[PDB]
Ligand binder design. Structure first.
Ligand SMILES: O[C@@H]1[C@@H](O)[C@H](O)OC[C@H]1O
Ligand SMILES: [Ca+2]
Length: 330
């Protein structure tokens, strides 16, 4: 109402684009430029996305280019609907677009599409990646040359229906003192369109080295994992869903276990929160989204960016998207 107008006035970022609704930004530096692979929210006059665009910043501070639509669900034979939060990777001169979509039978899986350029167009594989399920893929290009796929989202994302990579209708989200579910991780094969191994659960620990509890909604994993490397450590960051933050944890291994550190992003306007963290020349950035452009509509978002800093001790200061003095939307 007027509480949202206050946030709009003190927002630290403006929508990087406004001619289309965008969400779940996955930022990468490919071929000397910053490419962003977001979802494309559609306004039906309800997360029913059907296609993906690719955005680019040629250099820091540059205007954002909309490189156009690069993949539509009609060219994904195994998928019926809901083209959700994607990501990209490069290897052997190819660019791969990883995306979650829903099969006709209602189950999410992660597919991949291949192109010869970062802007595509991408030709989707006929089937989804074997061993994948749930949503929100993130592909880490490790400094050592390997690529790792991270995925998972609870609630609507369906990760709660799986244990040890197998689906069960009676599998539900854990409660109380039971450990909360973590994202999945699997090294990718050199061909990039297949996993090189079955995925494993990524464990997030508290200050005492104990796994996060299911009843710890302030810190336990909800959706949208992202991993970046900095100062010899792996940083796992993710959304907490119902508590609306992007939190992060650290490990000396891409597989974890990751020890919880703190909140990386405070609550944004709109129920969902999703992000990526990417180094572009002289600056790390947090890419995120909110629903301010749409007037607070959770399903119609816009992506944003902000400078991010690692402190000398490796920690990352909380980013307040409408200022630290703002009344939090959640
Ligand atoms: O993947 C995103 C998902 O994490 C969120 O739940 O809803 C929007 C999707 O785009
Ligand atoms: Ca993501």
């Amino acid at each position: 109402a007027a509480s949202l107008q206050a946030l709009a006035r003190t927002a630290i970022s403006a929508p990087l684009v406004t001619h289309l609704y965008t969400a779940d930004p996955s930022a990468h530096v490919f071929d000397g430029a910053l490419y962003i692979y977001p979802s494309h929210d559609l306004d039906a006059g309800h997360f029913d996305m059907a296609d993906y665009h690719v955005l680019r910043m040629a250099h820091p501070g540059a205007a954002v280019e909309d490189l156009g639509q690069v993949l539509h669900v009609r060219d994904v034979p195994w998928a019926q609907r809901q083209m959700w939060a994607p990501d990209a990777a490069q290897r052997n001169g190819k660019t791969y677009l990883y995306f979650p979509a829903k099969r006709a039978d209602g189950m999410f899986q992660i597919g991949v599409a291949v192109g010869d350029r970062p802007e595509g167009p991408f030709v989707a594989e006929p089937q989804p990646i074997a061993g994948t399920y749930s949503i929100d893929p993130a592909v880490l290009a490790d400094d050592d040359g390997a690529h790792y796929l991270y995925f998972g989202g609870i609630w609507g994302g369906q990760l709660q229906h799986y244990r040890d990579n197998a689906y069960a209708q009676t599998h539900q989200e854990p409660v109380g003192d039971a450990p909360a579910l973590g994202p999945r991780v699997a090294r990718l094969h050199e061909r990039m369109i297949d996993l090189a191994e079955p995925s494993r659960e990524v464990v997030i620990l508290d200050e005492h080295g104990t796994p996060l509890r299911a009843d710890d909604h302030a810190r336990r994993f909800f959706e949208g994992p992202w991993v970046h490397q900095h100062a010899g450590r792996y940083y796992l960051s993710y959304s907490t869903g119902d508590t609306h933050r992007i939190c992060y944890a650290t490990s000396d291994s891409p597989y974890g276990p990751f020890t919880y550190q703190g909140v990386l992003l405070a609550p944004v306007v709109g129920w969902t929160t999703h992000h990526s963290i990417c180094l572009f020349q002289q600056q790390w950035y947090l890419f995120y989204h909110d629903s301010v452009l749409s007037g607070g509509q959770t399903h119609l978002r816009s992506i944003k960016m902000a400078p991010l800093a690692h402190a000398a001790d490796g920690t990352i200061a909380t980013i307040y998207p409408y200022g630290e003095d703002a009344v939090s939307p959640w």
